Symmetry: C3
Subunit: 55 residues, 3 copies
């Protein structure tokens, strides 16, 4: 009875684990977002290719 | 005097909490970045709609 | 012999440190992704500027 230790909750004290996974899936949301964006950009790429063939 | 325990700093040993919030706000920075990007893409969408009406 | 404490591994219990750095470099991957996207958008910006000068 002297040197006692409290409850060491490593899985609770953190609480960021759920955040890590969330943030991960978040970027994936943007990664795909850029993909869709990139698509519209494929349009402009063609818009200035043949679409502008008229002169 | 035998089984002693050191200082268990759960809020210090981590040090990632500040990083989690930072990374979170970071994606938000990109999420909005895609939004602005998406805007320019709205342009190309119209560029090939009426803008190319000339033939 | 009474109040004993187990092995408190703060650097092991976490295991998210490697994830934090990974996610960080991940966004950077998108940040640059938006940059390249933004580029194609510079095109559409010009596509509707002089490219459409024809009427």
């Amino acid at each position: 009875g002297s040197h006692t230790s409290p409850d060491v909750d490593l899985g609770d004290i953190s609480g960021i684990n759920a955040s890590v996974v969330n943030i991960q899936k978040e970027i994936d949301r943007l990664n795909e977002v850029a993909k869709n964006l990139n698509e519209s950009l494929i349009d402009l790429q063609e818009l200035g290719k043949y679409e502008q063939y008229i002169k």
